[PDB]
Design a protein around this ligand. Structure first.
Ligand SMILES: COc1nc(-c2cccc(-c3cccc(-c4cnc(CNC[C@@H]5CCC(=O)N5)c(OC)n4)c3Cl)c2Cl)cnc1CNC[C@@H]1CCC(=O)N1
Lengths: 126, 126
């Protein structure tokens, strides 16, 4: 039974920081890269599409462009780790990691973003 | 490139009717049932979990008990059709069909439920 797990289903991050959110999947000693698909989304927006051992950047949502990547050196450990740089208030929400590696499963992770007044005021208006 | 498609991304259904919502996936020549996974959810409620050519009812949300099924004769034609019997107002929302058949993809379907006053009043009080 193929199961994705999360060490944390909640992250609380500061505006302007970097965050790495993690999804674990079973890898028995050697990764079959050809079989692996890793997909991350939030609110139906494509963040990562990792297929055939490479990230496909073409259909990544504009909000994550040049700010989101998969840490590929974690995949051999069975860790799908999404790193987002320079966190914004619009990054708060529910993320899903969808993994195919023989079997298929997904998990949800909630991200909360703390921000000072000036950042919040910009978000509130625009 | 493995792609799931939907003939309709919107269904408008009457309270008390039956609905069948459809996701299509490519099947060339013959279906390899052992490789197929079909999952249906709405709002994080597990509806259908079809793996190893059988439904796993243990993880199904209680509100879909004896009221939701996957039309298995459709699968060899590349149609994942979810039938829900006796539609309620709680069935309105966004559904996802997630399919693994070599590759993996999903699609969203929106369902709107029309209901008369009496049914709406019960739902409103709940
Ligand atoms: C039967 O059992 C279960 N099956 C699944 C499941 C089943 C099949 C496949 C997948 C799956 C896997 C990997 C990737 C993708 C995928 C998705 N989207 C794209 C979209 N890209 C752009 C394109 C264009 C826009 C768009 O709309 N599409 C993509 O890139 C093409 N790849 C997917 Cl769908 C999953 Cl996750 C999950 N959960 C349960 C099991 N119940 C769930 C519960 C919850 C906790 C648990 O423990 N269990």
């Amino acid at each position: 039974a193929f199961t994705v797990t999360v060490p944390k289903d909640l992250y609380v991050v500061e505006y302007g920081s970097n965050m790495t959110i993690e999804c674990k999947f079973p890898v028995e000693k050697q990764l079959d890269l050809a079989a692996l698909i890793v997909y991350w989304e939030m609110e139906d927006k494509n963040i990562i599409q990792f297929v055939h051992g490479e990230e496909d950047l073409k259909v990544q949502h504009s909000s994550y462009r040049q700010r989101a990547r998969l840490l590929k050196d974690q995949l051999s450990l069975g860790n799908a780790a999404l790193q987002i740089t320079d966190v914004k208030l619009q990054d708060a929400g529910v993320y899903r990691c969808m993994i195919s590696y023989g079997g298929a499963d997904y998990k949800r992770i909630t991200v909360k973003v703390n921000a000072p007044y000036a950042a919040a005021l910009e978000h509130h208006h625009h």
